[PDB]
């Protein structure tokens, strides 16, 4: 679990929204897993706009925070899970990491700010839905 708290949105995978979410929903995309809804409270997270593919991740199922090196935001192809069939997902970054089900929607961090939160991941892999393309999260 987890979110991106920029302004008054709250980005989450789409797989992990919650009712709350659906009924103050601003945008959401199956293709990227990615939902944003709307907060009452002002968040304190920065959107990073670059290009690094150098940066840091939360990982849950470890409780630590691991450096890694990513692919560019691109199309990719995602085995079967409990929440979509096998298909190809856009803007998504590879790295070498650990990664379980469950990390998805911790934040990937560059010195920049926020670059994207984890959404795939399996065999000492794990795959990031890049946010750095949604210039109006921070209007
Ligand atoms: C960190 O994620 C994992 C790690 C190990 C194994 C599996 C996963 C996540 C599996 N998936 C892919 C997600 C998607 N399509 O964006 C939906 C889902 O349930
Ligand atoms: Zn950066």
């Given at each position: 679990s987890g979110a991106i708290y920029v302004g008054n949105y709250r980005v989450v995978n789409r797989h992990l929204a919650t009712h709350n979410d659906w009924a103050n929903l601003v945008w959401e995309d199956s293709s990227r897993d990615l939902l944003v809804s709307s907060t009452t409270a002002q968040g304190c997270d920065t959107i990073a706009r670059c290009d690094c593919q150098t940066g840091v991740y939360y990982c849950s199922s470890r409780r630590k925070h691991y450096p890694v090196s990513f692919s560019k935001p691109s199309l990719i192809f995602v085995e079967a899970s409990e929440y979509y069939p096998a298909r190809y997902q856009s803007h998504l970054m590879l790295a070498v990491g650990h990664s379980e089900?469950?990390?998805?929607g911790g934040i990937l961090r560059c010195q920049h700010g926020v670059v994207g939160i984890v959404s795939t991941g399996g065999n000492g892999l794990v795959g990031f839905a890049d946010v750095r393309d949604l210039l109006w999260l921070d209007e």
């Open positions: 089900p469950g990390d998805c």
